[PDB]
Amino acid sequence: SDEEILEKLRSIVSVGDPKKKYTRFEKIGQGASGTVYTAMDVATGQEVAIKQMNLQKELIINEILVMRENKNPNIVNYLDSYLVGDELWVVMEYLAGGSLTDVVTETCMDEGQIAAVCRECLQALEFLHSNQVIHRDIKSDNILLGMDGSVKLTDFGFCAQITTMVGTPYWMAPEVVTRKAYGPKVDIWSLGIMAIEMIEGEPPYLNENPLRALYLIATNGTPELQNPEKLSAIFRDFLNRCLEMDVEKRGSAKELLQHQFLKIAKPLSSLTPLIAAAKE
Numbered sequence: 001s002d003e004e005i006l007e008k009l010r011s012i013v014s015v016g017d018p019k020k021k022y023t024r025f026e027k028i029g030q031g032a033s034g035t036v037y038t039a040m041d042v043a044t045g046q047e048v049a050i051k052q053m054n055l056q057k058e059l060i061i062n063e064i065l066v067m068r069e070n071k072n073p074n075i076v077n078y079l080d081s082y083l084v085g086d087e088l089w090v091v092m093e094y095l096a097g098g099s100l101t102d103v104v105t106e107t108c109m110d111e112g113q114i115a116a117v118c119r120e121c122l123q124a125l126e127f128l129h130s131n132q133v134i135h136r137d138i139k140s141d142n143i144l145l146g147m148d149g150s151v152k153l154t155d156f157g158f159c160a161q162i163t164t165m166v167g168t169p170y171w172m173a174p175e176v177v178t179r180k181a182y183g184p185k186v187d188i189w190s191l192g193i194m195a196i197e198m199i200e201g202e203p204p205y206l207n208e209n210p211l212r213a214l215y216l217i218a219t220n221g222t223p224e225l226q227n228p229e230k231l232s233a234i235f236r237d238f239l240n241r242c243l244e245m246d247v248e249k250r251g252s253a254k255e256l257l258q259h260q261f262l263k264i265a266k267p268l269s270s271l272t273p274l275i276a277a278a279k280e
């Protein structure tokens, strides 16, 4: 029953006032789905991320329980949740070293550094997909980095869902653009686009308006590289497996974690000078 659901939700969310438990709020994102802030956990002295969502309920209960019971080092993990009147606040981890967008727009990554990042992102995807969660918004903006090179996937555009056109145009799979065929493989396509961001600094068609880019992806399908000859055969093979037109042929996160390209990954510490240079 209706009221028995609101009482179950009230029993699952954390006790306390998040306006008192968190301080130094700084708005980092906003859209029609909600607001994202960074904040300081008063008790722990750790920087956190907080998503605030209004009325837009039994699904909420299972979704909260799933993220509270399932943790992974390559995602910003659920820390707490609160009901503030009609709003639901979700507190999760945060990394303040910067985003992969900062790194790719400011610095040049080598194949060893791209392989390390791809591996960490693939581990996050494998975890989410095993919990029937499809991200739908994989892109460099959603990869937070720690100063030590640690990698955490976030969902600050509110796209992830347990299995309306969702995502960011340049990173969308063709089957999402043409028929909204969401599935784990759209995250693999998006990772392939993010791997292109790491080589060229941008996804394909970034110079075009986002709506035209949809028409370019729907017609071109598998995007072409500017200078493929500058890449190893193993990296090129990894990209082809991520950007396969055939959904079935496209590699899963589990399969791609076995790819020979990831075997050349440099330690995550190799990203620290890029993070530092991208920050300033």
Ligand SMILES: CCN1c2ccc(F)cc2N=C(N[C@H]2CCN(C(=O)NC(C)(C)C)C2)c2cc(Cl)ccc21
Pocket (backbone or CB within 6 Å): 053, 059, 060, 061, 063, 064, 066, 067, 068, 070, 071, 075, 076, 077, 078, 090, 092, 128, 131, 133, 135, 153, 154, 155, 160, 161, 162
């Ligand atoms: C905040 C942790 N979080 C997560 C981190 C980083 C990400 F990139 C995605 C992501 N999304 C998850 N679940 C989805 C599904 C439902 N949901 C969601 O906020 N539900 C409400 C609004 C709270 C009810 C997003 C997720 C899934 C698992 Cl198994 C573990 C942690 C998760």
